[PDB]
């Protein structure tokens, strides 16, 4: 559906086919894996679908649906903050490119109001949405989108180009005051500081310097180039293209996809565990690029023309079959291994744990390293 | 044409059945080769928290 909102239904089918077997998503969602990501990355796409349907159409109902699914993500995973900073950013860009409308006001204000009041109901989140830096971008775009709308009312009556820089200067002034306000508030101690992992995504050397437990877990490390292939074969070269093709024909949906792509490519490079969040956009981008190629080379509607169309389409169909094979092999070889039983079977872990369960006192306490706490 | 729309609708239904099959089949290697067990470290805790929900109540969870 999300791709069907950016180009056509054919590109949507390609995107769904890609995401179904893509090793990058498969890695954190194999049968047995029961972490938060399993359902989380599903809710993310649903939320994004409703947001785009709400932003292009301009409807209150779809913005409410987006808000409710955003609440579901807030209640499910801890990486909801990505949405909290991606939906405002898209809106902010749309203000700067001059593409403000009333559909934008309606969609964003309804999503923000319902989503924020509903995401303060999870006990873990508490009052973070109103007093934490990570959730302040949204609040900025909430206030800003109200000056701009007044702008429009007071664009029409001035009825001249005096208003052009009359608007620009006002924008700069507000933009400056707010960041200073945040800084001042943050220094005073009212607004909380950027969390201790999000800062690490900018100050790459910060983790080791202060937090010594974040730099021991393998998950939070950079990735070498081979991994961006082992996980999204063929799609990885075809994604940067799709981004350019979506850039030649800017629409609001495309502005969204472009921002998503840039930010997640940076984050995925800087940290391994954030590759999963990049896998959906890659599929969508690949789906656009291949679909565009197909649209110029599958419509058989002349020896040279037929020969060229067949050679091009056949090459890409070959790459699609190669994709299926590569993905299945990768899934079998690397991402399907159980952890409790090392293949030889070596059953030492379960054997020891069961001994501890059967031949020890029910109230006894076991002192081991943190890595094996949950398993015990 | 109505015929072309009907064809497209049926084709999409069949394509989606194929997609669901592909996804589940690719995901079941570990469950077919060893057994149905929870894998990794965090899922273990998640499993415990679900057995506590399912066995007591939503309020006590």
């Amino acid at each position: 559906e999300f791709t069907k909102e950016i180009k056509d239904a054919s590109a949507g089918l390609l995107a769904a086919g890609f995401i179904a077997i893509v090793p990058g998503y498969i890695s954190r969602s194999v049968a047995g894996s029961y972490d938060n990501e399993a359902i989380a990355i599903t809710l993310l796409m649903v939320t994004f679908m409703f947001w785009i349907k709400a932003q292009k159409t301009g409807s209150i109902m779809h913005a409410t649906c987006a808000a409710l699914f955003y609440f579901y993500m807030v209640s499910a995973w801890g990486g909801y903050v990505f949405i909290t900073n991606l939906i405002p950013l898209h809106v902010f860009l749309l203000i700067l490119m001059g593409r403000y409308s009333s559909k934008l006001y309606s969609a964003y204000t309804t999503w923000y109001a319902i989503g924020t009041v509903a995401s303060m109901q999870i006990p873990f989140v508490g009052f973070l949405p109103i007093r934490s830096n990570d959730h302040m971008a949204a609040l900025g775009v909430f206030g800003l989108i109200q000056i701009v709308a007044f702008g429009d009312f007071v664009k029409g009556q001035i009825s001249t180009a005096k208003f052009k820089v009359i608007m620009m200067v006002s924008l700069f002034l507000i933009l400056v005051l707010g960041v200073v306000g945040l800084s001042a508030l943050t220094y005073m101690g009212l607004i909380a500081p950027w969390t201790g992992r999000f800062y690490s995504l900018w100050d790459t050397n910060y983790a080791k310097i202060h937090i010594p437990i974040i730099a021991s877990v393998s998950e939070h490390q950079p990735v070498s180039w081979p991994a961006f292939f082992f996980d999204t074969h063929f799609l990885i070269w075809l994604f940067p293209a799709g981004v350019f093709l979506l850039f030649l024909d800017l629409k609001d949906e495309h502005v969204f996809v472009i921002a998503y792509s840039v930010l997640c490519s940076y984050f995925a490079g800087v940290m391994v565990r954030l590759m999963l969040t990049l896998t959906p956009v890659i599929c969508v981008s690949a789906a656009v690029a291949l679909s565009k190629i197909f649209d110029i080379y599958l419509d058989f509607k002349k020896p040279a023309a037929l020969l060229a169309k067949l050679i091009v389409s056949g090459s890409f169909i070959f790459y699609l079959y190669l994709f299926v094979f590569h993905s299945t092999w990768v899934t079998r070889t690397a991402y399907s291994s159980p952890s409790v039983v090392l293949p030889s079977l070596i059953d030492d872990f379960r054997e020891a744990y069961y001994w501890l369960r059967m031949n020890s006192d029910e109230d006894s306490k076991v002192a081991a390293w943190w890595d094996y706490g949950y398993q015990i | 044409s109505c015929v072309l729309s009907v064809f497209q609708t049926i084709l999409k239904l069949v394509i989606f059945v194929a997609i669901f099959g592909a996804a589940i089949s690719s995901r079941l290697f570990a469950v077919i080769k060893f057994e149905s067990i929870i894998h990794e470290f965090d899922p273990w805790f998640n499993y415990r928290a679900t057995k506590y929900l399912v066995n007591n109540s939503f309020y006590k969870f």
Binding site: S216, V217, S218, E219, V272, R273, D371 | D42
Partner: peptide
């Protein structure tokens, strides 16, 4: 990749 010490 998992929540474990390297």
């Amino acid at each position: 990749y998992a929540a474990a010490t390297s």
